[PDB]
Each structure stands twice: as C-alpha cells, then as structure tokens.
Amino acid sequence: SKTQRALQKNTNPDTDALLKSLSDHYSLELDEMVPKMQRLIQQCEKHQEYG
C-alpha cells in the first residue's frame, strides 16, 4: 500500500502518458523541423551559387 501510494504521488504524468508524449514530440520534430532545416540547407547552397 505504501509503494502504491508512492506511485500515485509520483505519477503526474503517467509513465505511459509520458512515453506517448515523448514519441509524439519525436515524430513532430522529424515531420516539421527536420524537413525545414533541409530546405534551409538547400537554399543556402543556391545562394552560394548566386555568389
């Protein structure tokens, strides 16, 4: 009972909820941020050619 009470006090956020949040955040970074950065890299390469 002491261990269960300690788990409930320490459970905000639920470990399963937290792992889900972590997995969502990881997917968001790959879908939005990584491609944005790739686009910017490509743009910089074009500007070099313009130079």
Binding site: K36, L40, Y50
Partner: protein, 50 residues
C-alpha cells in the same frame, strides 16, 4: 535556434543581391548604353551579311 539560423541565411543573401545591383548601375550609364547599341547594330549587320 532554427529561427535564428534561418534569419541569418536570408540577411546574407539580400546583402549579396544589393551589391550586385549597385555594380550594374555603375557599369551601364545612358551614354554607354547608347554606344552599346551602336556596336550591336554594326555587329548584327555583319552577322546578317556573312
């Protein structure tokens, strides 16, 4: 960090473009443009005859 790097890249590109356009304005004055036109006309007439 991503926003900052994007702003830096855009600023460098605009500087480079500004300086290019300033050099072109210095090179093709109305007097010179008229001469370049005369030279063209003579060259074009030669290309046509040949």
């Amino acid at each position: 960090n991503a926003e900052y790097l994007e702003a830096k890249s855009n600023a460098l590109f605009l500087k480079l473009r500004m300086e290019e356009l300033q050099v072109l304005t210095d090179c093709y004055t109305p007097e010179k443009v008229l001469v370049h036109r005369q030279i063209r006309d003579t060259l074009e007439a030669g290309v046509k005859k040949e």
